[PDB]
Design a protein around this motif. Structure first.
Motif, PDB file in Angstrom:
ATOM      1  N   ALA A  83     -45.390 -16.609 -50.247  1.00 40.22           N
ATOM      2  CA  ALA A  83     -44.771 -16.460 -50.902  1.00 40.22           C
ATOM      3  C   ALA A  83     -44.878 -16.594 -52.244  1.00 40.22           C
ATOM      4  CB  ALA A  83     -46.092 -17.872 -51.483  1.00 40.22           C
ATOM      5  N   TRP A  84     -43.051 -16.043 -52.624  1.00 39.07           N
ATOM      6  CA  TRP A  84     -43.292 -15.358 -53.799  1.00 39.07           C
ATOM      7  C   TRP A  84     -43.806 -15.986 -55.051  1.00 39.07           C
ATOM      8  CZ3 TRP A  84     -39.763 -11.480 -53.302  1.00 39.07           C
ATOM      9  CH2 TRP A  84     -39.171 -11.128 -51.949  1.00 39.07           C
ATOM     10  N   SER A 128     -30.969 -19.377 -53.801  1.00 40.18           N
ATOM     11  CA  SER A 128     -31.877 -18.983 -53.100  1.00 40.18           C
ATOM     12  C   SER A 128     -33.032 -18.605 -54.226  1.00 40.18           C
ATOM     13  CB  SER A 128     -31.552 -17.612 -52.047  1.00 40.18           C
ATOM     14  OG  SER A 128     -30.790 -16.761 -52.312  1.00 40.18           O
ATOM     15  N   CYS A 163     -45.239 -23.928 -54.710  1.00 38.27           N
ATOM     16  CA  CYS A 163     -44.271 -23.116 -55.144  1.00 38.27           C
ATOM     17  C   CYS A 163     -43.924 -21.705 -54.798  1.00 38.27           C
ATOM     18  CB  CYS A 163     -45.124 -22.280 -56.207  1.00 38.27           C
ATOM     19  SG  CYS A 163     -46.547 -21.825 -56.265  1.00 38.27           S
ATOM     20  N   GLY A 164     -43.043 -20.886 -55.222  1.00 38.73           N
ATOM     21  CA  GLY A 164     -42.478 -20.583 -53.988  1.00 38.73           C
ATOM     22  C   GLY A 164     -41.908 -19.443 -52.506  1.00 38.73           C
ATOM     23  N   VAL A 165     -41.682 -20.719 -52.161  1.00 37.18           N
ATOM     24  CA  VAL A 165     -40.858 -20.873 -50.774  1.00 37.18           C
ATOM     25  C   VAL A 165     -39.265 -22.397 -51.434  1.00 37.18           C
ATOM     26  CG1 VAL A 165     -41.245 -22.142 -48.590  1.00 37.18           C
ATOM     27  CG2 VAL A 165     -42.846 -20.948 -50.047  1.00 37.18           C
ATOM     28  N   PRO A 166     -38.383 -20.783 -51.502  1.00 31.91           N
ATOM     29  CA  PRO A 166     -36.303 -21.776 -51.866  1.00 31.91           C
ATOM     30  C   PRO A 166     -36.478 -22.306 -50.329  1.00 31.91           C
ATOM     31  CG  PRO A 166     -37.037 -19.223 -52.068  1.00 31.91           C
ATOM     32  CD  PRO A 166     -38.607 -19.404 -51.422  1.00 31.91           C
ATOM     33  N   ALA A 167     -35.904 -23.428 -51.191  1.00 31.89           N
ATOM     34  CA  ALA A 167     -35.534 -24.377 -49.459  1.00 31.89           C
ATOM     35  C   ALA A 167     -33.955 -23.457 -49.244  1.00 31.89           C
ATOM     36  CB  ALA A 167     -34.857 -25.323 -50.016  1.00 31.89           C
ATOM     37  N   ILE A 168     -33.371 -22.431 -49.561  1.00 28.19           N
ATOM     38  CA  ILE A 168     -32.869 -22.124 -48.994  1.00 28.19           C
ATOM     39  C   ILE A 168     -33.222 -20.608 -49.103  1.00 28.19           C
ATOM     40  CG2 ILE A 168     -30.602 -20.689 -50.116  1.00 28.19           C
ATOM     41  CD1 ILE A 168     -29.949 -23.583 -50.910  1.00 28.19           C
ATOM     42  N   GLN A 169     -33.232 -20.013 -48.325  1.00 23.00           N
ATOM     43  CA  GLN A 169     -33.292 -18.369 -47.890  1.00 23.00           C
ATOM     44  C   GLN A 169     -32.819 -17.194 -48.515  1.00 23.00           C
ATOM     45  OE1 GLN A 169     -36.574 -19.615 -44.456  1.00 23.00           O
ATOM     46  NE2 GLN A 169     -36.104 -17.310 -44.730  1.00 23.00           N
ATOM     47  N   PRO A 170     -33.146 -16.201 -49.703  1.00 24.26           N
ATOM     48  CA  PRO A 170     -32.913 -15.443 -49.865  1.00 24.26           C
ATOM     49  C   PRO A 170     -33.108 -13.593 -48.647  1.00 24.26           C
ATOM     50  CG  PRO A 170     -35.149 -15.303 -51.073  1.00 24.26           C
ATOM     51  CD  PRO A 170     -34.813 -16.733 -49.967  1.00 24.26           C
ATOM     52  N   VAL A 171     -31.767 -13.701 -49.011  1.00 26.61           N
ATOM     53  CA  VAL A 171     -31.055 -12.371 -48.364  1.00 26.61           C
ATOM     54  C   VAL A 171     -30.680 -11.590 -48.603  1.00 26.61           C
ATOM     55  CG1 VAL A 171     -29.614 -11.591 -46.267  1.00 26.61           C
ATOM     56  CG2 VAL A 171     -29.970 -14.112 -46.224  1.00 26.61           C
ATOM     57  N   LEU A 172     -32.034 -10.155 -48.552  1.00 28.86           N
ATOM     58  CA  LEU A 172     -32.031  -9.033 -49.232  1.00 28.86           C
ATOM     59  C   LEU A 172     -31.425  -7.760 -48.367  1.00 28.86           C
ATOM     60  CD1 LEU A 172     -34.774  -9.191 -51.909  1.00 28.86           C
ATOM     61  CD2 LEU A 172     -32.775  -7.692 -51.106  1.00 28.86           C
ATOM     62  N   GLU A 224     -27.447  -6.854 -56.159  1.00 30.08           N
ATOM     63  CA  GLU A 224     -26.536  -7.258 -55.067  1.00 30.08           C
ATOM     64  C   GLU A 224     -26.515  -8.748 -55.743  1.00 30.08           C
ATOM     65  OE1 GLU A 224     -28.965  -8.175 -51.937  1.00 30.08           O
ATOM     66  OE2 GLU A 224     -27.585  -7.063 -50.882  1.00 30.08           O
ATOM     67  N   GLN A 282     -29.366  -9.828 -57.163  1.00 32.02           N
ATOM     68  CA  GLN A 282     -30.571  -9.233 -57.204  1.00 32.02           C
ATOM     69  C   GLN A 282     -30.994  -7.888 -56.941  1.00 32.02           C
ATOM     70  OE1 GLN A 282     -30.670 -11.754 -53.450  1.00 32.02           O
ATOM     71  NE2 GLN A 282     -30.354 -10.517 -52.136  1.00 32.02           N
ATOM     72  N   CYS A 334     -44.332 -19.226 -57.310  1.00 33.85           N
ATOM     73  CA  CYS A 334     -46.212 -19.401 -58.162  1.00 33.85           C
ATOM     74  C   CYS A 334     -46.409 -18.837 -59.509  1.00 33.85           C
ATOM     75  CB  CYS A 334     -46.704 -18.362 -56.597  1.00 33.85           C
ATOM     76  SG  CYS A 334     -45.906 -20.253 -55.191  1.00 33.85           S
ATOM     77  N   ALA A 372     -40.576 -24.124 -57.832  1.00 35.75           N
ATOM     78  CA  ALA A 372     -40.929 -23.305 -58.684  1.00 35.75           C
ATOM     79  C   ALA A 372     -41.679 -21.800 -57.945  1.00 35.75           C
ATOM     80  CB  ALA A 372     -42.572 -24.365 -59.338  1.00 35.75           C
ATOM     81  N   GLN A 394     -33.264 -28.374 -54.102  1.00 37.25           N
ATOM     82  CA  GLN A 394     -33.395 -27.711 -52.912  1.00 37.25           C
ATOM     83  C   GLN A 394     -32.633 -25.811 -53.710  1.00 37.25           C
ATOM     84  OE1 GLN A 394     -31.269 -27.005 -48.458  1.00 37.25           O
ATOM     85  NE2 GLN A 394     -32.377 -28.864 -49.645  1.00 37.25           N
ATOM     86  N   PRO A 448     -34.792 -19.491 -56.868  1.00 36.61           N
ATOM     87  CA  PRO A 448     -34.499 -21.447 -57.251  1.00 36.61           C
ATOM     88  C   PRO A 448     -34.650 -21.511 -59.023  1.00 36.61           C
ATOM     89  CG  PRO A 448     -35.872 -21.333 -55.290  1.00 36.61           C
ATOM     90  CD  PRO A 448     -35.300 -20.841 -55.231  1.00 36.61           C
ATOM     91  N   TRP A 449     -35.507 -20.587 -59.101  1.00 39.43           N
ATOM     92  CA  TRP A 449     -36.924 -20.582 -59.659  1.00 39.43           C
ATOM     93  C   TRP A 449     -35.963 -20.151 -61.296  1.00 39.43           C
ATOM     94  CZ3 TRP A 449     -38.459 -19.337 -55.410  1.00 39.43           C
ATOM     95  CH2 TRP A 449     -39.006 -17.545 -54.865  1.00 39.43           C
TER      96      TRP A 449
END
Lengths: 95, 10, 4, 131, 131, 95, 10, 4
Positions: free
Chosen positions: A56-57, D11, B1-10, D5, A7, D107, D105, D101, D13-14
């Protein structure tokens, strides 16, 4: 090539400033990003360029094309999703 | 949508 | 340029 | 991605991977719902390819990925192959993704959305890490 | 083609044009028989596109072209989208091309064929005449 | 872009000499031609590169890729058909 | 195959 | 380079 998902953070550029790099190749339905020491590359095409909106992404770009060598000093070119969303909803709707 | 269960880490 |  | 990285597994998931029958991963895509994937037109997807969901490590034999067949390909049809402009295709899955998990999707924006220059966004993928 | 020349109409009877539903001509192809067309994998053909045979002038309303539907797309599957290597796709037509003076097949070589450097060949098409 | 079908004569190059222009991008299943004051261009992809063999035109290359500007001094890259013919016959045979 | 009814002119 |  890498096995594990990668990423990267990168900023959005304006089409106008994008045009300094890419000229007339930059069309309305495109959006540039990057030129920041990172770059999308061969194999990434089709993947997402997401931005956080109201928590939200959101799908803002679709990896499209860029430098042949994935130069980290040149912006990558993504498909501009806002320009293409009407098409997505019509297809979903009809299908 | 757009709210992942597991949080991205930047 | 090149496609990605 | 060059100079990116590793992501925290699951993380994003889509994110899906497009793979041909020989198992080669050729393009990425994003789930927009259980039944549709958005990807690039120039990826040239056919209904003989497969959409891989929930995957992090392509090495892996023990991950619980979902291998989804494609029912129909919808290439945008203002897609301009000379310019690569309007580079989007919709993939209608034969069987629905099972949301979990690690599978969910992204948005979509309003046609009216503003995403300013300067805004810090994220791009993910399994593309080349070096040229 | 840049710096080419107009062809004598119907002199390259195996040349076809690939057109999307909006009527835009995006790629060329070659008839290898009445039922199959060879083209490039990266053209990204879907079965919603059409194969135009017997055409010379794309302006034309009075030419007797054949508009053929595609039944199945066969992308080679050593096709490598990162390198564009093995860039060939087979198109299986829904209805056979009708062979005539202006519609016929190109021959295929033996795997064993030798085509020396220096040999003068021909390339045809409706691509850009200037960049 | 042109309405009427165009054609052009151009010579075949060796992969080795092709590599002087294109380096490592030139793979086995590719064949170069051109660099002769003519060039295949955007829109030509997928079309034929034919050579006369024992009096019949033979499919030797499939228009693939080349210079972004269609430079007439750089060779175009075509898919090498001899390398891919076994695949064609198997598909025809099975289909 | 490879023998057009109408001859190419080069 | 570029695709054609």
């Amino acid at each position: 090539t890498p096995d594990r998902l990668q990423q990267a953070s990168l900023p959005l550029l304006s089409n106008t400033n994008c045009k300094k790099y890419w000229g007339t190749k930059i069309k309305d339905a495109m959006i540039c990003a990057g030129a920041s020491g990172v770059s999308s590359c061969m194999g990434d095409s089709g993947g997402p360029l997401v931005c956080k909106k109201n928590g939200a992404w959101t799908l803002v770009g679709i990896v499209s094309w860029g430098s042949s060598t994935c130069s980290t000093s040149t912006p990558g070119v993504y498909a501009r999703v806002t320009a293409l969303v009407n098409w997505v909803q019509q297809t979903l709707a009809a299908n | 949508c757009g709210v992942p269960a597991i949080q991205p880490v930047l | 340029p090149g496609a990605y | 991605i060059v100079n990116g990285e590793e992501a925290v597994p699951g993380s994003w998931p889509w994110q899906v991977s497009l793979q041909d029958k020989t198992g080669f991963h050729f393009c990425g895509g994003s789930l927009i719902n259980e039944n549709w994937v958005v990807t690039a037109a120039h990826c040239g997807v056919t209904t003989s390819d497969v959409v891989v969901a929930g995957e992090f490590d392509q090495g892996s034999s023990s991950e619980k990925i979902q291998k989804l067949k494609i029912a129909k390909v919808f290439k945008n049809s203002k897609y301009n192959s000379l310019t690569i402009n309007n580079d989007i295709t919709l993939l209608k899955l034969s069987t629905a993704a099972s949301f979990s998990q690690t599978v969910s999707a992204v948005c979509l924006p309003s046609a009216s959305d503003d995403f300013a220059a300067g805004t810090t966004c994220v791009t993910t993928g399994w593309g080349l890490t070096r040229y």
